[PDB]
Amino acid sequence: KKLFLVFWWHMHQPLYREPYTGEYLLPWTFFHAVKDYYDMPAYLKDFEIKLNFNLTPVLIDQIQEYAQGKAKDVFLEAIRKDPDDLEKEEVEKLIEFTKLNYEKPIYRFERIRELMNKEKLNREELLDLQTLNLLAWCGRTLRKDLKDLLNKGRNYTQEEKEYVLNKYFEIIKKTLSIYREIKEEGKGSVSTSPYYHPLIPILLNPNCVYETTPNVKIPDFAVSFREDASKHVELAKEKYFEIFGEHPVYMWPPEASVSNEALELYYEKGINMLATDEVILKNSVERASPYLRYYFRELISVFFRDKTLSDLIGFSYHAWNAEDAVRDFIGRLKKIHESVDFQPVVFVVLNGENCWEYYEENGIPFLEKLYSTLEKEEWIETLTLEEAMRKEDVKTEVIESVKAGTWFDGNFLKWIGNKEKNEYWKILIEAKKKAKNDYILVAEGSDWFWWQGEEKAPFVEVFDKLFRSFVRRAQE
């Protein structure tokens, strides 16, 4: 009797490319490409397990632009320059970026602490600040190759910084090829999402928010977004086909977001399986075991992720010693294995790039220990999405209706339903009436609404500038 374990690592960035200048206004796609997007599939070269990945089309576009040398990334330009050529504004931006990342374990360099404690920085100090900001985002592969430069910790020269940059761009240029390779070798399945990561259930039917939050106020949806919902899915299928040569049959719904209407749309678009969150199952049925394959109206297969396990990795284990965290995770799988007489399917689904910056050494000791341990436990079989979809010796159940929601508490409150988020929707609704190009689709991405109307939010003004620039461009 096996336990079937399915990892599905979701990779996404909103479009940081300002449409009028072409400038990438934040470096997050670059930094997660060099830290996570190559290295997460690359674990499959060293560990004999299956791991699955979701890549959004808008992320793929940006990886392609960086790989082609075409991305004009304003923060990265300030890193590359000789410090003697740095603008006053660029020095301020380098300092602020460091301050915002300062407490993350991947920034634990003694030299960064000294530099931040200085009033004015000379050329040699700025070179270290530039290069250490680069090296903080070093991924597993290059932590081996650049080991000696990493152990320097200070006193970096322009030549050394340029060397690091060249190795980083080499990783980016190989990234889409590693996803093709692990897919063709059967080491994992690759899925995609509707193109700009929108909330499909809201685009199809804004009133579905009232299934979980009846007291919420929403704007007047005086225009239909239903055909845009279809476009996001269709364009995503075409982009995936561009990269991999086949149409996708698995999709990750952005924010785990499903509704009866959304599931019908994914079925109509030829999607054979998706996953969503355990809270949706709990809201939709009484007997909510997430260890079964579900069939929605015999049209599409649905798995519900194990929320506990997914959130342990995504939010809890950064605060743990790595061996203890692996012991805890394996112990939880053992208890699931002992708790049922059938073979349970255990979906672990979360973002593949967001939690690691908070782990010691970018979570590399944790993942290496976790993957090494899993590959030797003969009662665990990790599966591709294709294998999870086909497995005959699992329990199944038919489901006829779901209550619409997301993996955020089963509801949509992170993107709609307060004064400030509703103004964004009102802006989008009015722009849609006058839209003349697909930049309206860019503005439908979930990220813009995530950041709106939130205190904290690092670089909130940049996301607001991007959203409103896409809204403006869509009407020209």
Ligand X SMILES: OC[C@H]1O[C@H](O[C@H]2[C@H](O)[C@@H](O)[C@@H](O[C@H]3[C@H](O)[C@@H](O)[C@@H](OC[C@H]4O[C@H](O[C@H]5[C@H](O)[C@@H](O)[C@@H](O)O[C@@H]5CO)[C@H](O)[C@@H](O)[C@@H]4O)O[C@@H]3CO)O[C@@H]2CO)[C@H](O)[C@@H](O)[C@@H]1O
Q: How many CA atoms lie within 13 A of 452 on its CB side?
A: 25
Question: Would you say 14 or 290 has its CB closer to ligand X?
Answer: 14
> Do 14 and 347 contact (CB within 8 A), yes or no?
no
Pairwise CA distance, residues 179 & 41, whole Å: 7
Q: Which of 12, 161, 231, 403 forms a contact with ligand X (CB under 6 A)?
A: 12
| Min CB(354)–ligand X separation in Å | 4
**CB proximity list for 122: less than 8 A, separation 6 or greater:** none
458 binds ligand X (CB under 6 A): yes
Q: Which tokens in the block code for residue 205?
A: 């039917």
**Closest distance of CB 447 from ligand X, Å:** 4
Residue entry with tokens 């990334």: 73
Strand partners, 303: 275
The interface region with ligand X, picked from 75-83, 129-137, 213-221, 309-317 by CB under 6 A, is: 309-317
| 305 sits near ligand X (criterion: CB under 6 A) | no
Q: Does 447 bind ligand X (CB under 6 A)?
A: yes
Among 115, 138, 208, 350, binds ligand X (CB under 6 A): 350
Going 313 to 318 to 320 to 324, the CA torsion angle's sign is positive
Span from 46-54, 181-189, 262-270, 351-359 in contact with ligand X (CB under 6 A) = 351-359
CA dist 143 and 404 (Å) reads 43
Least CB distance to ligand X at residue 460 (A): 8
Q: Binding mask 397-436 vs ligand X (x if CB under 6 A, - otherwise)?
A: ----------xx-----x----------------------
User: Quick count: other Cβ atoms within 10 Å of Cβ 390?
Assistant: 11
Helix, strand, coil: what percent of the chain each, to 5? Answer: 55, 10, 35
**CB nearer ligand X, residue 253 or residue 344:** 253
Cα-based torsion angle of the residue sequence 114, 119, 125, 128 in order, rounded to the nearest 10 degrees: 50
Instruction: Tell the smallest beta-carbon distance from residue 46 to ligand X (Å).
Output: 23
* Piece of the chain touching ligand X by CB under 6 A; list 39-47, 143-151, 345-353, 435-443: 345-353
The piece of 6-14, 230-238, 284-292, 393-401 that touches ligand X (CB under 6 A) is 6-14
Q: CA 294, CA 296: separation in Å to the nearest integer?
A: 6
> 121 or 140, CB closer to ligand X?
140
Nearer to ligand X, 149 or 350 (CB): 350
The Cα–Cα gap between 142 and 349 comes to: 26
Give the interface segment with ligand X, choosing from 150-158, 159-167, 332-340, 350-358 (CB under 6 A): 350-358
Nearer to ligand X by Cβ, of 192 and 310: the residue is 310
According to CB under 6 A, which residues from 312 to 341 bind ligand X? 314
Nearer Cβ to ligand X (107/156):
107
Query: Smallest gap, in angstroms, from Cβ of residue 164 to ligand X?
Result: 20
From 14, 290, 363, 405, residue interacting with ligand X (rule: CB under 6 A): 14
Q: How many CB atoms lie within 10 A of CB 100?
A: 12
* C-alpha distances out from residue 447 to 57, 404, 416, 421, 444, Å: 14, 19, 12, 11, 9
Residue 301 phi, psi (nearest 5): -90, 140
* CA-based nearest residue to 257, from 26, 427, 449: 449
| CB of 338 vs ligand X, minimal distance in Å | 26
Residues 6+ apart with CB under 8 A from 51: 7, 9, 40, 41, 43, 44, 182, 187, 188, 382
Told to check if 161 binds ligand X by CB under 6 A, we report no
Select from 7-15, 124-132, 167-175, 207-215 the region that touches ligand X (CB under 6 A).
7-15
Q: Which is nearer to ligand X, 130 or 310 (CB)?
A: 310
Which residue number, 7 or 407, has a Cβ lying nearer to ligand X? 407
Residues 6+ apart with CB under 8 A from 263: 274, 296, 297, 299, 300, 302, 402
Report how many residues bind ligand X under the rule CB under 6 A.
Answer: 21
> Which residue, 411, 407, 409, 427, is CA-closest to 216?
411
> By the criterion CB under 6 A, which residues form the site for ligand X?
10, 12-14, 28, 32, 310-311, 314, 350-351, 353-354, 407-408, 414, 446-447, 450, 458-459
